[PDB]
């Protein structure tokens, strides 16, 4: 019956919405972004 | 009684920094402080001046 | 304070007095604040809304290439204040044990 019952996002307090947004952004945007600093760091440290 | 004996060591043998080191070790070990030892050392050593 | 500002003290005694000042007055508050600095609880205040990654500028499109000076500006993360008691040895001790 929960599926029939609606769960609007806009009926959610701003602070909980912010926490959920932070988690989702971390999971989908920050984590997916790829940066290959290993080669540069190793070369700099070796020189 | 042990703390007072260690302080009497300073009293009777002189101003030896190794006794001070022992008293310092009594207070703290591996980053954990023993409040009873700290308080007893303070009470028995400092107020006499 | 006189030991701190003294210049002729032996090195061991100068270091000892500096460390004694830190231990007597500042060590506990420093420890508590360092423990609390690991977490970021951000109230939704107008000051928080005012925060931006880059200072208002025009140097570059992705904000000014120059950052703001680190540690300078508005920080709204909650950190409990420091509490200190005056050193006074003429006040009455608590009647209870």
């Amino acid at each position: 019956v929960a599926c029939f019952r609606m769960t609007p996002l806009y009926n959610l307090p701003t602070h909980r919405a912010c926490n959920m947004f932070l988690e989702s952004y971390k999971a989908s945007w920050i984590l997916t972004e790829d940066h290959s600093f290993e080669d540069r760091m190793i070369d700099d440290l070796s020189k | 009684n042990h703390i007072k004996s260690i302080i009497s060591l300073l009293d009777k043998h002189g101003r030896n920094h190794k006794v001070l080191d022992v008293l310092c070790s009594l207070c703290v070990c591996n980053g954990v402080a023993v409040r009873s030892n700290q308080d007893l050392i303070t009470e028995n050593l400092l107020p006499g001046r | 304070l006189h030991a701190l500002e003294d210049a002729r003290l032996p090195g061991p005694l100068r270091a000892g007095y500096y460390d004694l000042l830190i231990s007597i007055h500042l060590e506990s508050a420093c420890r508590s604040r360092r423990s609390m600095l690991s977490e970021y609880i951000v109230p939704l205040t107008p000051e928080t809304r005012a925060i931006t990654l880059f200072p208002p500028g025009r140097s570059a499109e992705d904000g000014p290439r120059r950052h703001g000076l680190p540690g300078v500006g508005v920080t709204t993360s909650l950190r409990p204040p420091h509490h200190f008691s005056p050193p006074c040895f003429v006040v009455a001790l608590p009647a209870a044990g």
Binding site: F4, R5, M6, P8, N11 | - | -
Partner: protein, 94 residues
């Protein structure tokens, strides 16, 4: 009896005082029993009620109002919320 709309109000009166009698003297009511009163007698409406938002507001009202003080005004306004929730599917309320 009398005018039909009036009779409807006395039906409200009697249904609320049914539970007032059990917990309080005649008029005093507690949410402890107002929850059962609403969820039982308005069971017919919620079956056909599709305003998930309003029924959720009612489910929030019940856990908000556990403090347990209520009167006729509170009961009638909340059951009015329930009936408008049920019927607003039937009829547009904007």
């Amino acid at each position: 009896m009398g005018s039909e709309l009036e009779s409807a109000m006395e039906t409200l009166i009697n249904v609320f005082h049914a539970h007032s009698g059990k917990e309080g003297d005649k008029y005093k009511l507690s949410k402890k029993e107002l929850k059962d009163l609403l969820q039982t007698e308005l069971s017919g409406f919620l079956d056909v009620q599709k305003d998930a938002d309003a029924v959720d507001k009612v489910m929030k009202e019940l856990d908000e109002n556990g403090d347990g003080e209520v009167d006729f005004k509170e009961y009638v306004v909340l059951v009015a919320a329930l009936t408008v929730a049920c019927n607003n599917f039937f009829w547009e309320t904007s």
